[PDB]
Structures are given as structure tokens and as C-alpha cells.
């Protein structure tokens, strides 16, 4: 199946690998590129798994994995149809090369010194240029680690097609599902499950340690506004909640909180962050970043002379913003594409800043860029939403911008229901100016109000 030598070898079959393959092929039109993917599926995008796939009213959505965007346009979760790819076997013999995906195969050893790697079935493959695009694995909760296998079996860690399938089936079978975690993924799943639950009259609970949803990223006002919005989707939200233990009590899961509260439920979804997939650093003799996690790479995403790293697993040097590790779709696309350019001699640093988005249904959306963290100083500027200011229409307060500052300069921006303005946010961050008045900068985002106390 696997050829013995491949020029370009990409480890992991996700978003960063797909983008690098595309980039390599655009820059070297006869290039021969092999993606080694431990999953059985060809490369696909994750965002719809917590969003549009749940809003489909086609009962075969779980089989088709096609969805409608908020504006009604239908598409596949897969980046390309299967016919786009060439077989791994044909890859050395096909005139003008191509991209092949070896599915169901895991790279288990990296022998950097010999430009060679080993698969789980013992096959060995040599390369000229290699990209590590291994992503991450969801973290669990130590309280759940400590509980039995019975609790573990009724806890979902949500990241793939198989998890969407299993959880979707669970939502049709049980009466109560509890999401643990207040981040964007937990909050997206809450709204998705809350929507499903209204048709059946069942319950969705969300609990997290912070005062409100996305508390680690959004300042207080907007975090609180968001918690109230999730509640309006028919979710019972429980802020200020730290899990002490989880057990089974009379068939039910019983979550005990540190404050003495107890929550009975049928199933748990644990959305408490990602562990970057760095097992290959050991055999590879590659450095892991002890501050941010992931493989430590430079401004050009390079680890060693013929090894790059992109996507969720790459801790990189941002010449403007400092060392970072980002776990976002567009970042996987941007960093995968850049690695591909650098693998074909571009020698370019990360410059173009990647973006983030989240939707809580067709009516509420966030976009963000740069360094966004609720511990940084912030300035928020808000206004009443017009008709156009929701994810669907783009494709008392209801919208606004939040500037995140360091050394008096904007280093991150969150846009709340403001669409088609990311280029402006990216420019503000790039220019690094000390703004005399951020209410005047907010006018760049079509927010036009008198100054308000804060
Ligand atoms: C449900 C969900 C919803 C999301 N929604 C949003 C959103 O709305 N907006 C946003 O900005 N971001 C979102 N994200 C984040 C985004 O999807 C990720 O940042 C992106 O998938 C990262 O791409 P990646 O290629 O780095 O890793 P992945 O897409 O994780 O791909 C890595 C692949 O490599 C495989 N692999 C790992 N190790 C090996 C090995 N040793 N050998 C072979 N294969 C291996 C993994 O199994 C996996 O298949 C979401 C993520 C999830 C899970």
C-alpha cells in the first residue's frame, strides 16, 4: 500500500495536512504528497460537528455528513471528494503526481537522523520533507479518570465524526445530558443539544467553574450575556461549578460539586480542552514547549532541517505577538498552507494572522483574532444589533467589539455579531498603534455611540 519513499510526507489527515498538501501542489505542480492518517476517514472539517450538522432537518444527516450553512447552501464535511485523491500505490507512477491518503495507519516512530518513519504495521517510509500535523486529543476530567469504567463509558469526549454520531444517538435515547466545560465547544454543543431537546422535551445541563460562558476569553458583561442566551436555548446553565466527584447512583450519573451541590443526569460530555499530540517527539528527539505544550517550532514553523509542524500541535514564534500555540480551524489552514510554502523553499515567517469564529446557531456569532484572554486588560464598545448582524444574514445591546491590550496597544480583538470586518481587525493588530480613543476605533466596525461608563 505505502510506497517506500515519498518526497512530501504529511503526518495526520486533518485540516493542516490538507491545506499543506494543497499549498505544496500549487507551488510544485508535479509534487508527490502522501498523508498518513490514523483515522479511517479522508480529511474533513470539524466545525460543523458542533454546529450546522445538528441544525439539519434531514434525518439522514448522520449518514450523508452534508449540511447547510446558515444561508442554506449545502456542502460536505470532507475537504474534497474521494476522486480528488490518487491511491498511495499509484503515487510514484502517476504522471504529474498527486495527493494520496493512507487511511487507518499511524506513524509510531520518527527517525529524524535517517529521514525515515515507521507505521504501526511495521512499514517504513523515507521522505525528503515532512510535516507533523497531528492535532490534539481531548482532555478528560481527573474526577472522571478516578471514577469507574461505568462512568467513563457514559462520558463523551467530542472531536470526531464518530463522536457526533454517538452523541446524536444518545440525544435521542436519554432524558438528561450534562456538558462539563464553558468554552466555545461546550457552549456550541449546549445550544445544539438544547435545540434537539425542545422537540423531545428532554434536558440539557451545562456546568463550568467560571462565572459565565467563555469566561476565560470574554469579559464579564459579554460572558454573562452569553450565559443568558444559552439559557434561552433551553439549557440549564450552572456557573461557579467545580466537579469534586462523579459516581453512578441507581442507574443515574451523580455529579458532586465542590460547593456541595449534586446534579443527577444520564450522560456527560466533557469539553475541557485539548492535549496536543506529541508522542512522536520522543523517538524524533524533538523539543516540546513546556509553557504552551506542543512541538516547539520557529517563526517559519520549522522544527529541524526537513521537518515542519502546523495546526493545533505547533507551538510557534510569532514575531509580532510572541510565542504562542493556537487551536483554531483557520489557524490550521493558514499554518498548513505556510508550512507547505516553506517545504517548497518559501522561507516565510508566520505573519498573516489567523482568525477564530463561533456560532451559537444562526442568530449569534463571534469572530476573534490575535491574543484574546479575559485576564488581559480590555475595552468593550457595544451597540444595538441591526437586521444584518447575525451569522445567517452576513452570508438592549446586540453587537460590539472588544479590544484586548498589552503595553497600551491592541493585541487581540473579539467581534460580537459583526461580520465581514476581519481584514480591518487584522490591520489594527498589524499596525500596533497607541490609540487615543478606542470608541473612535470602534467606528471602523460600524459601532457609533456616545461614550459609556466601564
Ligand atoms: C467539534 C469541533 C468544533 C470546532 N469548531 C471550531 C470553530 O467553529 N472555529 C474554529 O476556529 N475552530 C474550531 N475547531 C478547532 C479546529 O477544528 C481545529 O483547530 C483543527 O481541526 C486543527 O487541525 P489539525 O490539522 O491541527 O488537527 P486535526 O484536525 O485534529 O487532525 C489531526 C489528525 O491527525 C491524526 N493523527 C494524530 N497522530 C497521528 C499519527 N501519529 N499518525 C497518523 N495520524 C495521526 C489525528 O487522529 C487526526 O485525524 C473545532 C474543533 C472541533 C473538534
CSV table of C-alpha atoms and ligand atoms in Angstrom, one decimal:
chain,number,residue,atom,x,y,z
A,1,UNK,CA,0.0,0.0,0.0
A,2,UNK,CA,2.6,2.6,1.2
A,3,UNK,CA,5.4,3.4,-1.2
A,4,UNK,CA,8.9,3.1,0.4
A,5,UNK,CA,10.0,6.7,-0.4
A,6,UNK,CA,7.8,9.8,-0.8
A,7,UNK,CA,9.0,13.4,-1.4
A,8,UNK,CA,6.5,15.1,0.8
A,9,UNK,CA,5.1,13.2,3.8
A,10,UNK,CA,2.4,14.7,6.0
A,11,UNK,CA,1.7,13.1,9.4
A,12,UNK,CA,-2.0,13.3,10.4
A,13,UNK,CA,-5.0,13.6,8.0
A,14,UNK,CA,-6.7,16.7,9.3
A,15,UNK,CA,-7.1,20.4,8.3
A,16,UNK,CA,-3.5,21.4,8.5
A,17,UNK,CA,-2.3,18.5,6.4
A,18,UNK,CA,-5.0,19.0,3.8
A,19,UNK,CA,-4.0,22.7,3.5
A,20,UNK,CA,-0.3,21.9,3.3
A,21,UNK,CA,-0.9,19.3,0.5
A,22,UNK,CA,-2.9,21.9,-1.5
A,23,UNK,CA,-0.2,24.5,-0.9
A,24,UNK,CA,2.6,22.1,-1.9
A,25,UNK,CA,0.7,21.2,-5.1
A,26,UNK,CA,0.1,24.8,-6.0
A,27,UNK,CA,3.8,25.6,-5.6
A,28,UNK,CA,5.2,22.4,-7.2
A,29,UNK,CA,2.6,21.2,-9.7
A,30,UNK,CA,4.1,17.7,-10.1
A,31,UNK,CA,4.7,17.1,-6.4
A,32,UNK,CA,4.0,13.7,-4.9
A,33,UNK,CA,2.4,14.1,-1.5
A,34,UNK,CA,1.4,11.3,1.0
A,35,UNK,CA,-0.9,12.0,4.0
A,36,UNK,CA,-0.7,9.2,6.7
A,37,UNK,CA,-3.9,9.3,8.7
A,38,UNK,CA,-4.7,7.1,11.6
A,39,UNK,CA,-8.4,7.8,11.2
A,40,UNK,CA,-10.4,5.8,8.7
A,41,UNK,CA,-11.9,8.9,7.1
A,42,UNK,CA,-10.4,11.2,4.5
A,43,UNK,CA,-9.6,14.8,5.6
A,44,UNK,CA,-12.6,16.7,6.8
A,45,UNK,CA,-13.5,19.9,8.7
A,46,UNK,CA,-14.5,19.7,12.4
A,47,UNK,CA,-16.6,22.9,13.0
A,48,UNK,CA,-19.8,21.6,11.5
A,49,UNK,CA,-19.7,18.7,14.0
A,50,UNK,CA,-20.7,21.0,16.8
A,51,UNK,CA,-22.9,23.3,14.7
A,52,UNK,CA,-24.6,23.0,11.3
A,53,UNK,CA,-24.8,19.2,11.3
A,54,UNK,CA,-27.2,19.4,14.4
A,55,UNK,CA,-29.4,22.1,12.7
A,56,UNK,CA,-30.1,19.8,9.7
A,57,UNK,CA,-33.7,18.6,9.4
A,58,UNK,CA,-32.7,15.8,7.1
A,59,UNK,CA,-32.8,12.6,9.3
A,60,UNK,CA,-30.1,11.0,7.1
A,61,UNK,CA,-27.6,13.8,8.0
A,62,UNK,CA,-25.7,11.3,10.2
A,63,UNK,CA,-25.1,9.1,7.1
A,64,UNK,CA,-24.6,11.8,4.5
A,65,UNK,CA,-22.4,14.3,6.6
A,66,UNK,CA,-23.7,17.0,4.4
A,67,UNK,CA,-25.0,20.2,6.0
A,68,UNK,CA,-26.5,23.5,5.1
A,69,UNK,CA,-24.7,26.7,6.0
A,70,UNK,CA,-26.9,29.3,7.8
A,71,UNK,CA,-27.6,30.8,4.4
A,72,UNK,CA,-29.0,27.5,3.0
A,73,UNK,CA,-26.0,26.4,0.8
A,74,UNK,CA,-25.4,22.7,1.1
A,75,UNK,CA,-21.9,21.1,1.2
A,76,UNK,CA,-19.9,18.1,2.5
A,77,UNK,CA,-17.8,18.0,5.7
A,78,UNK,CA,-15.0,16.5,3.6
A,79,UNK,CA,-12.5,18.9,2.0
A,80,UNK,CA,-12.6,17.1,-1.3
A,81,UNK,CA,-14.4,14.1,-2.8
A,82,UNK,CA,-12.5,10.8,-2.7
A,83,UNK,CA,-11.9,11.0,-6.5
A,84,UNK,CA,-9.7,14.1,-5.9
A,85,UNK,CA,-7.1,11.8,-4.4
A,86,UNK,CA,-4.7,9.3,-6.0
A,87,UNK,CA,-4.1,5.9,-4.4
A,88,UNK,CA,-0.9,5.5,-2.3
A,89,UNK,CA,0.1,2.7,-4.6
A,90,UNK,CA,-0.2,4.8,-7.8
A,91,UNK,CA,1.5,7.8,-6.2
A,92,UNK,CA,5.0,7.1,-7.6
A,93,UNK,CA,3.7,6.1,-11.1
A,94,UNK,CA,1.1,8.7,-11.8
A,95,UNK,CA,2.3,11.3,-14.3
A,96,UNK,CA,2.3,14.7,-12.6
A,97,UNK,CA,2.0,13.3,-9.1
A,98,UNK,CA,-0.9,13.9,-6.8
A,99,UNK,CA,-2.1,13.7,-3.2
A,100,UNK,CA,-2.7,10.2,-1.6
A,101,UNK,CA,-4.1,9.4,1.8
A,102,UNK,CA,-3.1,6.2,3.6
A,103,UNK,CA,-6.1,5.8,6.0
A,104,UNK,CA,-6.1,3.6,9.1
A,105,UNK,CA,-2.3,3.9,9.5
A,106,UNK,CA,-0.5,5.5,12.4
A,107,UNK,CA,3.1,6.9,12.4
A,108,UNK,CA,4.6,5.4,15.5
A,109,UNK,CA,8.3,6.3,15.1
A,110,UNK,CA,10.2,9.2,13.7
A,111,UNK,CA,13.9,8.6,13.0
A,112,UNK,CA,14.9,12.2,12.2
A,113,UNK,CA,18.6,11.3,11.5
A,114,UNK,CA,17.5,8.9,8.7
A,115,UNK,CA,14.6,10.9,7.2
A,116,UNK,CA,12.6,7.8,7.9
A,117,UNK,CA,9.4,6.9,9.8
A,118,UNK,CA,7.7,3.7,10.8
A,119,UNK,CA,4.0,2.9,10.8
A,120,UNK,CA,2.0,0.8,13.3
A,121,UNK,CA,2.0,-2.2,10.9
A,122,UNK,CA,5.9,-2.0,10.7
A,123,UNK,CA,6.1,-0.4,7.3
A,124,UNK,CA,8.9,2.1,6.8
A,125,UNK,CA,8.8,5.2,4.6
A,126,UNK,CA,11.6,7.7,3.8
A,127,UNK,CA,10.9,11.3,2.9
A,128,UNK,CA,12.6,14.5,1.7
A,129,UNK,CA,10.3,16.9,3.5
A,130,UNK,CA,8.0,16.0,6.4
A,131,UNK,CA,5.1,17.9,8.2
A,132,UNK,CA,3.8,16.9,11.6
A,133,UNK,CA,0.1,17.8,11.7
A,134,UNK,CA,-1.1,15.5,14.4
A,135,UNK,CA,-3.6,17.9,16.1
A,136,UNK,CA,-4.7,17.1,19.6
A,137,UNK,CA,-6.7,14.6,21.8
A,138,UNK,CA,-9.5,15.9,24.1
A,139,UNK,CA,-8.5,16.1,27.8
A,140,UNK,CA,-10.7,14.3,30.3
A,141,UNK,CA,-11.5,15.4,33.8
A,142,UNK,CA,-9.4,13.8,36.6
A,143,UNK,CA,-12.7,13.3,38.6
A,144,UNK,CA,-13.9,11.2,35.7
A,145,UNK,CA,-10.5,9.4,35.4
A,146,UNK,CA,-10.9,8.5,39.1
A,147,UNK,CA,-14.5,7.2,38.6
A,148,UNK,CA,-15.2,3.7,37.3
A,149,UNK,CA,-15.3,2.4,33.7
A,150,UNK,CA,-19.1,2.6,34.0
A,151,UNK,CA,-18.9,6.5,34.4
A,152,UNK,CA,-16.2,6.6,31.7
A,153,UNK,CA,-18.4,4.7,29.3
A,154,UNK,CA,-21.1,7.3,29.7
A,155,UNK,CA,-18.8,10.3,29.1
A,156,UNK,CA,-18.2,11.6,25.6
A,157,UNK,CA,-15.0,13.4,24.6
A,158,UNK,CA,-16.1,15.3,21.5
A,159,UNK,CA,-13.9,15.7,18.4
A,160,UNK,CA,-14.7,13.4,15.5
A,161,UNK,CA,-17.4,12.2,13.2
A,162,UNK,CA,-17.8,9.1,15.5
A,163,UNK,CA,-18.5,11.3,18.4
A,164,UNK,CA,-21.1,13.3,16.5
A,165,UNK,CA,-22.7,10.0,15.6
A,166,UNK,CA,-22.6,8.5,19.1
A,167,UNK,CA,-23.8,11.7,20.8
A,168,UNK,CA,-26.6,12.3,18.3
A,169,UNK,CA,-27.9,8.8,19.1
A,170,UNK,CA,-27.5,9.5,22.9
A,171,UNK,CA,-29.6,12.7,22.5
A,172,UNK,CA,-32.5,10.5,21.1
A,173,UNK,CA,-32.2,7.9,23.8
A,174,UNK,CA,-31.7,9.6,27.2
A,175,UNK,CA,-33.6,12.3,29.1
A,176,UNK,CA,-30.6,14.4,30.5
A,177,UNK,CA,-27.2,15.2,29.1
A,178,UNK,CA,-24.7,17.3,31.0
A,179,UNK,CA,-21.9,19.2,29.3
A,180,UNK,CA,-18.9,20.0,31.5
A,181,UNK,CA,-16.9,23.0,30.2
A,182,UNK,CA,-17.9,26.6,29.4
A,183,UNK,CA,-15.6,27.2,26.4
A,184,UNK,CA,-16.8,27.7,22.8
A,185,UNK,CA,-17.1,24.0,22.1
A,186,UNK,CA,-19.1,23.2,25.2
A,187,UNK,CA,-21.3,26.2,24.6
A,188,UNK,CA,-21.9,25.2,20.9
A,189,UNK,CA,-22.8,21.7,21.9
A,190,UNK,CA,-25.1,23.0,24.6
A,191,UNK,CA,-27.0,25.1,22.1
A,192,UNK,CA,-27.1,22.2,19.6
A,193,UNK,CA,-28.4,19.7,22.2
A,194,UNK,CA,-30.8,22.3,23.6
A,195,UNK,CA,-32.3,22.7,20.2
A,196,UNK,CA,-32.7,18.9,19.8
A,197,UNK,CA,-34.1,18.6,23.3
A,198,UNK,CA,-37.0,21.0,22.6
A,199,UNK,CA,-38.6,18.6,20.1
A,200,UNK,CA,-38.4,15.8,22.7
A,201,UNK,CA,-39.0,17.8,25.9
A,202,UNK,CA,-35.7,16.5,27.4
A,203,UNK,CA,-33.0,18.3,29.5
A,204,UNK,CA,-29.5,19.7,28.7
A,205,UNK,CA,-27.3,20.9,31.6
A,206,UNK,CA,-24.1,22.9,31.2
A,207,UNK,CA,-21.7,23.4,34.1
A,208,UNK,CA,-18.3,25.1,34.4
A,209,UNK,CA,-16.1,26.8,37.1
A,210,UNK,CA,-16.3,30.3,35.7
A,211,UNK,CA,-19.0,33.0,36.4
A,212,UNK,CA,-20.4,32.6,32.9
A,213,UNK,CA,-19.9,31.1,29.4
A,214,UNK,CA,-16.5,31.6,27.7
A,215,UNK,CA,-15.3,33.2,31.0
A,216,UNK,CA,-11.6,32.6,30.2
A,217,UNK,CA,-11.9,34.6,26.9
A,218,UNK,CA,-14.7,37.1,27.1
A,219,UNK,CA,-15.0,39.9,29.7
A,220,UNK,CA,-17.8,39.8,32.3
A,221,UNK,CA,-20.6,41.6,30.5
A,222,UNK,CA,-20.5,39.6,27.3
A,223,UNK,CA,-19.8,36.3,29.2
A,224,UNK,CA,-22.9,36.9,31.2
A,225,UNK,CA,-25.0,38.0,28.2
A,226,UNK,CA,-23.9,34.7,26.5
A,227,UNK,CA,-24.9,32.6,29.5
A,228,UNK,CA,-28.4,34.1,29.3
A,229,UNK,CA,-28.5,33.4,25.6
A,230,UNK,CA,-27.6,29.7,26.2
A,231,UNK,CA,-30.3,29.5,28.8
A,232,UNK,CA,-32.8,30.9,26.3
A,233,UNK,CA,-31.9,27.9,24.0
A,234,UNK,CA,-33.4,25.7,26.8
A,235,UNK,CA,-30.1,24.8,28.6
A,236,UNK,CA,-29.9,24.8,32.4
A,237,UNK,CA,-26.5,26.6,33.0
A,238,UNK,CA,-24.7,26.2,36.3
A,239,UNK,CA,-21.8,28.6,36.7
A,240,UNK,CA,-19.3,28.5,39.6
A,241,UNK,CA,-19.2,24.7,39.5
A,242,UNK,CA,-16.1,22.6,40.1
A,243,UNK,CA,-16.6,18.8,39.9
A,244,UNK,CA,-15.4,17.0,43.1
A,245,UNK,CA,-16.5,13.5,42.1
A,246,UNK,CA,-18.7,11.5,39.7
A,247,UNK,CA,-20.5,8.2,40.5
A,248,UNK,CA,-23.3,6.0,39.5
A,249,UNK,CA,-26.3,6.0,41.8
A,250,UNK,CA,-29.3,3.9,40.8
A,251,UNK,CA,-28.5,3.8,37.1
A,252,UNK,CA,-28.0,7.7,37.0
A,253,UNK,CA,-24.8,9.6,36.9
A,254,UNK,CA,-24.5,11.7,40.0
A,255,UNK,CA,-22.0,14.7,39.8
A,256,UNK,CA,-20.9,16.1,43.2
A,257,UNK,CA,-19.7,19.7,43.1
A,258,UNK,CA,-17.1,21.1,45.4
A,259,UNK,CA,-19.7,23.6,46.8
A,260,UNK,CA,-21.8,20.7,47.9
A,261,UNK,CA,-24.4,20.8,45.1
A,262,UNK,CA,-25.3,17.5,43.4
A,263,UNK,CA,-26.5,17.0,39.8
A,264,UNK,CA,-28.3,13.8,38.5
A,265,UNK,CA,-28.0,13.1,34.8
A,266,UNK,CA,-27.9,10.3,32.2
A,267,UNK,CA,-24.8,11.2,30.1
A,268,UNK,CA,-21.8,13.6,30.3
A,269,UNK,CA,-20.0,15.5,27.6
A,270,UNK,CA,-16.6,16.7,28.8
A,271,UNK,CA,-15.4,19.7,26.8
A,272,UNK,CA,-12.4,20.8,28.9
A,273,UNK,CA,-9.7,21.4,26.3
A,274,UNK,CA,-7.1,19.6,24.2
A,275,UNK,CA,-3.8,17.8,24.8
A,276,UNK,CA,-1.6,18.3,21.8
A,277,UNK,CA,-0.5,15.0,20.1
A,278,UNK,CA,3.3,15.0,20.8
A,279,UNK,CA,4.1,11.3,21.2
A,280,UNK,CA,6.4,11.4,18.1
A,281,UNK,CA,8.7,14.0,19.8
A,282,UNK,CA,10.2,11.1,21.9
A,283,UNK,CA,11.6,9.0,19.0
A,284,UNK,CA,12.1,12.1,17.0
A,285,UNK,CA,14.4,13.8,19.5
A,286,UNK,CA,12.1,16.9,19.0
A,287,UNK,CA,11.6,19.6,21.6
A,288,UNK,CA,8.3,20.1,23.3
A,289,UNK,CA,7.3,23.5,24.7
A,290,UNK,CA,7.0,23.4,28.4
A,291,UNK,CA,5.0,26.7,28.6
A,292,UNK,CA,2.4,26.2,25.9
A,293,UNK,CA,2.7,22.5,25.0
A,294,UNK,CA,3.1,21.1,21.5
A,295,UNK,CA,6.2,20.8,19.4
A,296,UNK,CA,8.4,23.9,19.7
A,297,UNK,CA,8.9,25.4,16.2
A,298,UNK,CA,10.3,28.7,15.0
A,299,UNK,CA,8.7,31.6,13.1
A,300,UNK,CA,8.7,29.5,9.9
A,301,UNK,CA,7.1,26.5,11.6
A,302,UNK,CA,10.4,24.6,11.3
A,303,UNK,CA,11.5,22.0,13.9
A,304,UNK,CA,14.5,20.6,12.1
A,305,UNK,CA,16.0,20.9,8.6
A,306,UNK,CA,13.3,18.8,6.8
A,307,UNK,CA,10.6,18.8,9.5
A,308,UNK,CA,7.8,21.3,10.0
A,309,UNK,CA,4.8,21.3,12.3
A,310,UNK,CA,1.4,23.0,11.8
A,311,UNK,CA,-2.0,23.3,13.3
A,312,UNK,CA,-3.1,22.6,16.9
A,313,UNK,CA,0.2,20.8,17.7
A,314,UNK,CA,2.5,23.6,16.7
A,315,UNK,CA,4.0,26.0,19.3
A,316,UNK,CA,5.4,28.7,17.1
A,317,UNK,CA,7.2,32.0,17.4
A,318,UNK,CA,5.0,34.9,16.3
A,319,UNK,CA,7.4,37.7,15.5
A,320,UNK,CA,4.7,40.3,16.3
A,321,UNK,CA,2.8,38.7,19.2
A,322,UNK,CA,5.3,36.4,20.9
A,323,UNK,CA,5.5,32.6,21.3
A,324,UNK,CA,2.0,31.0,21.0
A,325,UNK,CA,0.1,27.8,20.3
A,326,UNK,CA,-3.3,28.2,18.6
A,327,UNK,CA,-6.1,25.6,18.2
A,328,UNK,CA,-8.4,27.0,15.5
A,329,UNK,CA,-9.7,25.9,12.1
A,330,UNK,CA,-8.4,28.9,10.2
A,331,UNK,CA,-5.1,28.6,12.0
A,332,UNK,CA,-4.8,25.0,10.8
A,333,UNK,CA,-5.5,26.3,7.3
A,334,UNK,CA,-3.1,29.2,7.5
A,335,UNK,CA,-0.3,27.4,9.2
A,336,UNK,CA,-0.7,24.3,7.0
A,337,UNK,CA,-0.5,26.5,3.9
A,338,UNK,CA,2.5,28.3,5.2
A,339,UNK,CA,4.3,25.1,6.1
A,340,UNK,CA,3.6,23.9,2.5
A,341,UNK,CA,5.2,27.0,1.1
A,342,UNK,CA,8.2,26.6,3.4
A,343,UNK,CA,8.5,23.0,2.4
A,344,UNK,CA,8.9,24.2,-1.2
A,345,UNK,CA,11.5,26.9,-0.3
A,346,UNK,CA,9.5,30.0,0.6
A,347,UNK,CA,11.4,30.6,3.9
A,348,UNK,CA,8.5,32.7,5.2
A,349,UNK,CA,7.6,33.5,8.8
A,350,UNK,CA,4.0,33.5,10.2
A,351,UNK,CA,2.7,36.9,9.5
A,352,UNK,CA,-0.8,36.8,8.2
A,353,UNK,CA,-2.8,36.4,11.5
A,354,UNK,CA,-5.3,33.6,11.5
A,355,UNK,CA,-8.9,34.1,12.8
A,356,UNK,CA,-11.4,32.3,15.0
A,357,UNK,CA,-15.2,32.1,14.9
A,358,UNK,CA,-18.0,30.5,16.9
A,359,UNK,CA,-21.8,30.5,16.3
A,360,UNK,CA,-24.5,29.7,18.8
A,361,UNK,CA,-27.0,29.0,16.0
A,362,UNK,CA,-27.9,31.2,13.0
A,363,UNK,CA,-28.6,34.2,15.3
A,364,UNK,CA,-25.4,34.8,17.4
A,365,UNK,CA,-21.8,34.8,16.2
A,366,UNK,CA,-18.3,35.7,17.4
A,367,UNK,CA,-15.1,36.3,15.5
A,368,UNK,CA,-11.7,36.8,17.0
A,369,UNK,CA,-8.1,37.4,16.2
A,370,UNK,CA,-4.7,37.8,17.9
A,371,UNK,CA,-4.2,37.4,21.7
A,372,UNK,CA,-7.7,37.0,23.3
A,373,UNK,CA,-7.7,36.2,27.0
A,374,UNK,CA,-10.0,37.7,29.7
A,375,UNK,CA,-7.0,38.3,32.1
A,376,UNK,CA,-5.7,41.0,29.7
A,377,UNK,CA,-7.0,44.5,30.0
A,378,UNK,CA,-10.0,45.0,27.7
A,379,UNK,CA,-12.2,47.8,26.4
A,380,UNK,CA,-15.6,46.8,25.1
A,381,UNK,CA,-17.7,49.0,22.8
A,382,UNK,CA,-21.3,48.0,22.1
A,383,UNK,CA,-24.4,48.9,20.2
A,384,UNK,CA,-27.9,47.7,19.3
A,385,UNK,CA,-27.9,45.0,16.6
A,386,UNK,CA,-29.5,45.7,13.1
A,387,UNK,CA,-31.1,43.1,10.8
A,388,UNK,CA,-27.8,42.2,9.1
A,389,UNK,CA,-25.8,41.5,12.3
A,390,UNK,CA,-26.2,37.7,12.6
A,391,UNK,CA,-24.3,34.7,11.1
A,392,UNK,CA,-27.1,33.9,8.7
A,393,UNK,CA,-27.7,37.5,7.3
A,394,UNK,CA,-24.0,38.0,6.8
A,395,UNK,CA,-23.8,35.1,4.3
A,396,UNK,CA,-30.5,46.4,24.6
A,397,UNK,CA,-27.0,45.8,23.1
A,398,UNK,CA,-26.8,43.1,20.4
A,399,UNK,CA,-23.3,43.6,18.9
A,400,UNK,CA,-19.9,45.1,19.7
A,401,UNK,CA,-16.1,44.9,19.6
A,402,UNK,CA,-13.7,44.1,22.5
A,403,UNK,CA,-10.1,45.3,22.3
A,404,UNK,CA,-7.5,43.3,24.2
A,405,UNK,CA,-4.5,45.4,25.2
A,406,UNK,CA,-0.8,44.9,26.1
A,407,UNK,CA,1.6,47.8,26.6
A,408,UNK,CA,-1.2,50.2,25.5
A,409,UNK,CA,-1.5,48.6,22.1
A,410,UNK,CA,-4.3,46.3,20.7
A,411,UNK,CA,-3.1,42.7,20.5
A,412,UNK,CA,-6.4,41.0,20.1
A,413,UNK,CA,-9.9,41.7,19.0
A,414,UNK,CA,-13.3,40.0,19.5
A,415,UNK,CA,-16.2,40.9,17.3
A,416,UNK,CA,-19.7,40.1,18.6
A,417,UNK,CA,-22.2,39.9,15.8
A,418,UNK,CA,-20.1,41.9,13.4
A,419,UNK,CA,-19.3,40.2,10.1
A,420,UNK,CA,-17.1,40.8,7.1
A,421,UNK,CA,-14.7,43.1,9.1
A,422,UNK,CA,-11.8,40.6,9.9
A,423,UNK,CA,-9.4,42.4,7.5
A,424,UNK,CA,-9.9,45.6,9.5
A,425,UNK,CA,-9.3,43.9,12.8
A,426,UNK,CA,-6.2,42.2,11.3
A,427,UNK,CA,-4.9,45.6,10.1
A,428,UNK,CA,-5.4,47.2,13.6
A,429,UNK,CA,-3.3,44.5,15.2
A,430,UNK,CA,-0.7,44.7,12.5
A,431,UNK,CA,-0.2,48.5,12.8
A,432,UNK,CA,0.4,48.4,16.6
A,433,UNK,CA,-0.7,52.0,17.1
A,434,UNK,CA,-1.4,53.5,20.6
A,435,UNK,CA,-5.0,54.7,20.1
A,436,UNK,CA,-6.0,57.9,21.7
A,437,UNK,CA,-9.7,56.8,21.8
A,438,UNK,CA,-10.9,53.2,21.2
A,439,UNK,CA,-14.5,54.5,20.8
A,440,UNK,CA,-13.2,56.1,17.6
A,441,UNK,CA,-11.5,52.9,16.5
A,442,UNK,CA,-14.9,51.1,17.1
A,443,UNK,CA,-16.3,53.2,14.3
A,444,UNK,CA,-14.2,51.2,11.9
A,445,UNK,CA,-16.5,48.3,12.9
A,446,UNK,CA,-19.7,50.3,12.3
A,447,UNK,CA,-20.3,50.9,16.1
A,448,UNK,CA,-21.4,54.5,16.5
A,449,UNK,CA,-22.3,55.6,20.0
A,450,UNK,CA,-21.5,58.2,22.7
A,451,UNK,CA,-19.0,57.1,25.3
A,452,UNK,CA,-20.5,54.9,28.1
A,453,UNK,CA,-19.1,54.2,31.7
A,454,UNK,CA,-17.0,51.0,32.1
B,1,LIG,C1,-16.1,19.7,17.2
B,1,LIG,C2,-15.2,20.8,16.9
B,1,LIG,C3,-15.7,22.1,16.5
B,1,LIG,C4,-14.8,23.1,16.2
B,1,LIG,N1,-15.3,24.3,15.8
B,1,LIG,C5,-14.4,25.3,15.5
B,1,LIG,C6,-14.9,26.6,15.1
B,1,LIG,O1,-16.1,26.8,15.0
B,1,LIG,N2,-13.9,27.6,14.8
B,1,LIG,C7,-12.6,27.4,15.0
B,1,LIG,O2,-11.8,28.3,14.7
B,1,LIG,N3,-12.1,26.1,15.3
B,1,LIG,C8,-12.9,25.1,15.6
B,1,LIG,N4,-12.4,23.9,16.0
B,1,LIG,C9,-11.0,23.7,16.0
B,1,LIG,C10,-10.5,23.1,14.7
B,1,LIG,O3,-11.3,22.1,14.1
B,1,LIG,C11,-9.0,22.6,14.8
B,1,LIG,O4,-8.2,23.7,15.1
B,1,LIG,C12,-8.4,21.9,13.6
B,1,LIG,O5,-9.1,20.6,13.4
B,1,LIG,C13,-7.0,21.6,13.8
B,1,LIG,O6,-6.5,20.9,12.6
B,1,LIG,P1,-5.2,20.0,12.8
B,1,LIG,O7,-4.9,19.5,11.4
B,1,LIG,O8,-4.1,20.7,13.5
B,1,LIG,O9,-5.6,18.7,13.6
B,1,LIG,P2,-6.8,17.7,13.4
B,1,LIG,O10,-7.9,18.2,12.5
B,1,LIG,O11,-7.0,17.2,14.8
B,1,LIG,O12,-6.1,16.5,12.6
B,1,LIG,C14,-5.0,15.7,13.1
B,1,LIG,C15,-5.2,14.3,12.6
B,1,LIG,O13,-4.1,13.5,12.7
B,1,LIG,C16,-4.3,12.3,13.3
B,1,LIG,N5,-3.1,11.7,13.9
B,1,LIG,C17,-2.6,12.1,15.1
B,1,LIG,N6,-1.5,11.4,15.3
B,1,LIG,C18,-1.2,10.7,14.3
B,1,LIG,C19,-0.1,9.8,13.9
B,1,LIG,N7,0.9,9.6,14.8
B,1,LIG,N8,-0.1,9.1,12.7
B,1,LIG,C20,-1.1,9.4,11.8
B,1,LIG,N9,-2.2,10.2,12.1
B,1,LIG,C21,-2.2,10.9,13.3
B,1,LIG,C22,-5.5,12.6,14.2
B,1,LIG,O14,-6.1,11.3,14.5
B,1,LIG,C23,-6.3,13.5,13.4
B,1,LIG,O15,-7.0,12.7,12.5
B,1,LIG,C24,-13.4,22.9,16.3
B,1,LIG,C25,-12.9,21.6,16.7
B,1,LIG,C26,-13.7,20.6,17.0
B,1,LIG,C27,-13.2,19.3,17.4
